[PDB]
Protein backbone atom coordinates (compact mmCIF):
# COMPACT_ATOMS: atom_id res chain seq x y z
CA UNK A 1 0.00 0.00 0.00
CA UNK A 2 1.10 3.57 -0.71
CA UNK A 3 0.86 6.16 2.05
CA UNK A 4 -1.87 8.60 0.97
CA UNK A 5 -1.47 12.37 1.36
CA UNK A 6 -4.10 14.99 0.60
CA UNK A 7 -3.38 18.68 0.28
CA UNK A 8 -5.71 21.67 0.19
CA UNK A 9 -4.46 23.00 -3.16
CA UNK A 10 -2.11 22.33 -6.02
CA UNK A 11 1.02 24.27 -4.99
CA UNK A 12 1.36 22.13 -1.85
CA UNK A 13 0.52 19.02 -3.87
CA UNK A 14 3.47 19.58 -6.21
CA UNK A 15 5.96 20.39 -3.45
CA UNK A 16 4.83 17.37 -1.44
CA UNK A 17 4.89 15.00 -4.43
CA UNK A 18 8.55 15.85 -5.01
CA UNK A 19 9.32 14.90 -1.43
CA UNK A 20 7.09 11.80 -1.49
CA UNK A 21 8.50 10.49 -4.78
CA UNK A 22 7.58 6.85 -5.35
CA UNK A 23 6.55 5.88 -1.80
CA UNK A 24 3.47 8.06 -1.33
CA UNK A 25 0.64 9.42 -3.45
CA UNK A 26 -0.29 13.11 -3.06
CA UNK A 27 -3.66 14.48 -4.18
CA UNK A 28 -5.09 18.00 -3.96
CA UNK A 29 -8.59 18.65 -2.62
CA UNK A 30 -9.12 21.57 -5.03
CA UNK A 31 -8.78 21.17 -8.80
CA UNK A 32 -6.21 23.27 -10.66
CA UNK A 33 -7.70 26.72 -11.19
CA UNK A 34 -10.13 26.53 -8.27
CA UNK A 35 -10.58 29.54 -5.99
CA UNK A 36 -8.75 28.58 -2.83
CA UNK A 37 -9.71 31.17 -0.19
CA UNK A 38 -13.44 30.42 0.09
CA UNK A 39 -13.63 27.04 -1.62
CA UNK A 40 -16.80 25.21 -0.71
CA UNK A 41 -16.03 21.50 -0.19
CA UNK A 42 -18.47 18.86 -1.41
CA UNK A 43 -19.48 15.76 0.57
CA UNK A 44 -17.19 13.74 -1.68
CA UNK A 45 -14.26 16.10 -1.00
CA UNK A 46 -14.66 15.18 2.68
CA UNK A 47 -14.85 11.46 1.94
CA UNK A 48 -11.71 11.70 -0.19
CA UNK A 49 -9.81 13.44 2.60
CA UNK A 50 -11.19 10.85 5.05
CA UNK A 51 -9.35 8.15 3.05
CA UNK A 52 -5.99 9.92 3.39
CA UNK A 53 -3.26 9.18 5.92
CA UNK A 54 -2.18 12.83 6.26
CA UNK A 55 -3.69 16.22 5.36
CA UNK A 56 -1.44 19.20 4.52
CA UNK A 57 -2.66 22.78 4.51
CA UNK A 58 -1.15 26.25 4.14
CA UNK A 59 -2.49 27.91 7.22
CA UNK A 60 -2.04 31.65 7.70
CA UNK A 61 -5.84 31.54 7.10
CA UNK A 62 -5.35 31.02 3.38
CA UNK A 63 -8.06 28.33 3.37
CA UNK A 64 -10.93 30.01 5.23
CA UNK A 65 -12.87 26.76 4.75
CA UNK A 66 -10.32 24.38 6.26
CA UNK A 67 -11.22 24.52 9.96
CA UNK A 68 -14.83 23.53 9.25
CA UNK A 69 -13.72 20.90 6.72
CA UNK A 70 -11.20 19.31 9.09
CA UNK A 71 -13.79 19.14 11.89
CA UNK A 72 -15.75 16.78 9.56
CA UNK A 73 -12.73 14.39 9.28
CA UNK A 74 -12.12 11.66 11.88
CA UNK A 75 -8.64 10.64 13.06
CA UNK A 76 -6.61 11.82 10.08
CA UNK A 77 -3.57 13.85 11.19
CA UNK A 78 -2.88 17.24 9.64
CA UNK A 79 0.17 19.46 9.38
CA UNK A 80 0.42 23.17 8.55
CA UNK A 81 3.19 23.63 5.99
CA UNK A 82 4.06 27.27 6.84
CA UNK A 83 5.26 26.64 10.41
CA UNK A 84 8.29 28.87 10.98
CA UNK A 85 7.65 31.44 8.23
CA UNK A 86 7.81 35.15 9.04
CA UNK A 87 4.33 36.33 7.95
CA UNK A 88 4.07 39.61 6.12
CA UNK A 89 1.15 41.84 7.16
CA UNK A 90 -1.28 43.03 4.53
CA UNK A 91 -0.17 46.64 4.55
CA UNK A 92 -3.30 48.45 3.30
CA UNK A 93 -6.96 47.96 2.57
CA UNK A 94 -9.76 46.15 4.41
CA UNK A 95 -7.38 43.42 5.62
CA UNK A 96 -4.69 45.79 6.95
CA UNK A 97 -2.60 44.18 9.67
CA UNK A 98 -3.61 40.56 8.92
CA UNK A 99 -1.05 37.94 7.92
CA UNK A 100 -0.68 37.66 4.15
CA UNK A 101 -1.04 33.94 3.34
CA UNK A 102 0.73 33.93 -0.05
CA UNK A 103 4.09 32.89 1.41
CA UNK A 104 4.98 30.39 -1.36
CA UNK A 105 5.78 33.19 -3.82
CA UNK A 106 9.14 33.67 -2.08
CA UNK A 107 11.46 30.84 -3.25
CA UNK A 108 13.31 31.07 0.08
CA UNK A 109 10.02 30.36 1.85
CA UNK A 110 9.60 27.24 -0.29
CA UNK A 111 12.58 25.75 1.56
CA UNK A 112 10.54 25.97 4.76
CA UNK A 113 7.51 24.43 3.06
CA UNK A 114 9.81 21.57 2.08
CA UNK A 115 11.16 21.13 5.61
CA UNK A 116 7.69 21.04 7.17
CA UNK A 117 6.36 18.56 4.62
CA UNK A 118 9.43 16.34 5.05
CA UNK A 119 8.99 16.41 8.83
CA UNK A 120 5.30 15.46 8.63
CA UNK A 121 5.92 12.63 6.18
CA UNK A 122 8.77 11.26 8.30
CA UNK A 123 6.61 11.58 11.42
CA UNK A 124 3.59 9.72 10.03
CA UNK A 125 5.29 7.30 7.58
CA UNK A 126 8.59 6.51 9.38
CA UNK A 127 9.25 3.31 7.37
CA UNK A 128 10.05 5.54 4.36
CA UNK A 129 12.09 8.20 6.21
CA UNK A 130 15.25 7.58 4.18
CA UNK A 131 13.36 8.19 0.93
CA UNK A 132 11.61 11.34 2.18
CA UNK A 133 14.86 12.78 3.52
CA UNK A 134 16.78 12.09 0.31
CA UNK A 135 14.01 13.48 -1.89
CA UNK A 136 13.64 16.58 0.25
CA UNK A 137 17.40 17.19 0.08
CA UNK A 138 17.45 16.80 -3.70
CA UNK A 139 14.36 18.96 -4.27
CA UNK A 140 15.59 21.67 -1.88
CA UNK A 141 18.78 21.94 -3.96
CA UNK A 142 16.60 22.63 -7.02
CA UNK A 143 14.64 25.29 -5.13
CA UNK A 144 17.74 27.01 -3.73
CA UNK A 145 19.04 27.30 -7.31
CA UNK A 146 15.85 29.17 -8.31
CA UNK A 147 16.69 32.40 -6.53
CA UNK A 148 19.94 33.47 -8.19
CA UNK A 149 18.78 33.95 -11.83
CA UNK A 150 15.44 35.46 -10.75
CA UNK A 151 17.15 37.94 -8.41
CA UNK A 152 19.64 38.88 -11.13
CA UNK A 153 16.98 39.46 -13.78
CA UNK A 154 14.70 41.56 -11.57
CA UNK A 155 17.63 43.60 -10.21
CA UNK A 156 18.06 45.18 -13.64
CA UNK A 157 14.72 46.99 -13.21
CA UNK A 158 15.74 50.40 -11.83
CA UNK A 159 14.67 50.75 -8.21
CA UNK A 160 12.60 53.87 -8.94
CA UNK A 161 10.37 51.88 -11.31
CA UNK A 162 10.14 48.79 -9.08
CA UNK A 163 6.48 48.93 -8.12
CA UNK A 164 3.67 46.38 -8.20
CA UNK A 165 0.00 47.34 -7.99
CA UNK A 166 -1.64 45.04 -5.46
CA UNK A 167 -5.23 44.39 -4.41
CA UNK A 168 -5.19 41.33 -2.12
CA UNK A 169 -1.42 40.93 -1.66
CA UNK A 170 -0.90 37.89 -3.86
CA UNK A 171 2.60 39.14 -4.84
CA UNK A 172 3.80 40.67 -1.58
CA UNK A 173 6.32 37.98 -0.74
CA UNK A 174 7.91 38.14 -4.19
CA UNK A 175 7.91 41.93 -3.87
CA UNK A 176 9.75 41.74 -0.55
CA UNK A 177 12.42 39.34 -1.85
CA UNK A 178 13.23 41.30 -5.02
CA UNK A 179 12.74 44.85 -3.78
CA UNK A 180 9.44 45.93 -5.30
CA UNK A 181 7.32 48.59 -3.68
CA UNK A 182 3.57 48.01 -3.48
CA UNK A 183 0.68 50.43 -3.96
CA UNK A 184 -2.76 49.12 -3.04
CA UNK A 185 -5.85 49.40 -5.23
CA UNK A 186 -9.13 49.03 -3.32
CA UNK A 187 -7.40 57.29 -7.83
CA UNK A 188 -4.19 57.65 -5.83
CA UNK A 189 -2.68 54.66 -7.66
CA UNK A 190 -2.72 56.88 -10.76
CA UNK A 191 -0.45 59.46 -9.11
CA UNK A 192 2.16 56.93 -7.97
CA UNK A 193 2.26 55.40 -11.46
CA UNK A 194 2.71 58.81 -13.12
CA UNK A 195 5.23 60.06 -10.56
CA UNK A 196 7.59 57.07 -10.79
CA UNK A 197 6.79 56.32 -14.46
CA UNK A 198 5.95 52.71 -13.63
CA UNK A 199 5.70 51.20 -17.13
CA UNK A 200 3.31 48.28 -16.52
CA UNK A 201 0.34 47.31 -14.34
CA UNK A 202 -0.79 43.74 -13.62
CA UNK A 203 -4.05 42.51 -12.12
CA UNK A 204 -4.64 39.85 -9.49
CA UNK A 205 -6.80 36.88 -10.48
CA UNK A 206 -9.20 36.98 -7.51
CA UNK A 207 -10.62 40.37 -8.57
CA UNK A 208 -11.99 42.28 -11.54
CA UNK A 209 -9.43 43.41 -14.09
CA UNK A 210 -11.40 46.61 -14.74
CA UNK A 211 -9.67 48.89 -12.17
CA UNK A 212 -6.18 47.78 -13.19
CA UNK A 213 -7.19 48.49 -16.79
CA UNK A 214 -8.46 51.94 -15.80
CA UNK A 215 -5.15 52.69 -14.08
CA UNK A 216 -3.26 51.67 -17.22
CA UNK A 217 -5.52 53.59 -19.62
CA UNK A 218 -5.27 56.82 -17.61
CA UNK A 219 -1.52 56.75 -16.84
CA UNK A 220 -0.38 55.39 -20.20
CA UNK A 221 1.27 52.45 -18.43
CA UNK A 222 1.09 49.17 -20.32
CA UNK A 223 -1.56 46.78 -19.06
CA UNK A 224 0.35 43.52 -18.59
CA UNK A 225 -2.70 41.42 -17.77
CA UNK A 226 -3.41 39.02 -14.93
CA UNK A 227 -0.78 37.23 -12.83
CA UNK A 228 -2.13 33.89 -11.56
CA UNK A 229 -0.27 32.63 -8.45
CA UNK A 230 -2.95 30.72 -6.49
CA UNK A 231 -2.85 27.51 -8.55
CA UNK A 232 -0.79 25.35 -10.83
CA UNK A 233 -2.14 24.25 -14.19
CA UNK A 234 -2.85 20.63 -14.98
CA UNK A 235 -0.09 18.11 -15.68
CA UNK A 236 -0.15 18.91 -19.39
CA UNK A 237 -0.75 22.63 -18.96
CA UNK A 238 1.84 25.43 -19.06
CA UNK A 239 2.33 25.82 -15.29
CA UNK A 240 2.49 22.18 -14.14
CA UNK A 241 4.93 22.65 -11.22
CA UNK A 242 5.82 25.03 -8.42
CA UNK A 243 9.15 25.70 -10.16
CA UNK A 244 7.35 26.60 -13.37
CA UNK A 245 4.97 28.90 -11.49
CA UNK A 246 7.82 30.87 -9.91
CA UNK A 247 9.85 31.07 -13.12
CA UNK A 248 6.88 32.04 -15.31
CA UNK A 249 5.62 34.69 -12.86
CA UNK A 250 9.02 36.38 -12.74
CA UNK A 251 9.41 36.16 -16.51
CA UNK A 252 6.03 37.85 -17.03
CA UNK A 253 6.90 40.65 -14.58
CA UNK A 254 10.38 41.16 -16.05
CA UNK A 255 9.01 41.28 -19.61
CA UNK A 256 6.45 43.86 -18.51
CA UNK A 257 9.40 46.02 -17.48
CA UNK A 258 11.32 45.47 -20.73
CA UNK A 259 13.79 43.12 -19.03
Distance CA 49, CA 186 (A): 36
Sheet containing 3-7, strands listed edge to edge, beginning at the edge strand earlier in sequence: 24-28, 3-7, 54-57, 78-80
How many Å from the N-terminal Cα to the C-terminal Cα in the chain?
49
Distance CA 193, CA 257 (A): 13
Resolution to 1 decimal place, in Å: 1.8
Instruction: Return the number of other C-beta atoms located less than 10 Å from residue 130's C-beta.
Output: 11
Domain ranges for the chain, please list them.
Answer: 3-155, 156-259
- Give binding residues for Fe(2+) as ranges: 37, 102, 168, 230
Burial (CB count <10 Å: 0-12, 13-18, 19+), residue 22: exposed
Looking at domain 3-155, its CATH class is alpha beta
What is 44-86 written as a DSSP string? HHHHHHHT-SEEEE--TTS-TTHHHHHHTS-S--EEETTTT--
- Give binding residues as ranges: 37, 102, 168, 230
Beta bridge partners of 211: none
Distance CA 62, CA 133 (A): 27
Closest CA to 61 of 91, 95, 16: 95
Whether the Cβ atoms of residue 20 and residue 121 lie closer than 8 Å to each other: yes
Helix axes 242-256 and 129-154, enclosed angle (nearest 10): 0
Dmax (CA) for the chain in angstroms is 61
Experimental method: X-ray
C-alpha angle with apex 165: 160 to 166, nearest 5 degrees?
A: 135
Helix axes 210-219 and 188-196, enclosed angle (nearest 10): 50
Whether the Cβ atoms of residue 242 and residue 104 lie closer than 8 Å to each other: yes
Distance CA 63, CA 241 (A): 20
Amino acid sequence: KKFKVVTTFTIIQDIAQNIAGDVAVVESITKPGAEIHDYQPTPRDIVKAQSADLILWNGMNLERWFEKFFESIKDVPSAVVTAGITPLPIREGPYSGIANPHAWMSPSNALIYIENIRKALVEHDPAHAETYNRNAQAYAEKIKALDAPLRERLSRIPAEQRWLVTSEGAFSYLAKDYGFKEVYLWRHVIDIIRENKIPVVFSESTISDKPAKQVSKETGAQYGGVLYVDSLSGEKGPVPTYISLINMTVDTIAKGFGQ
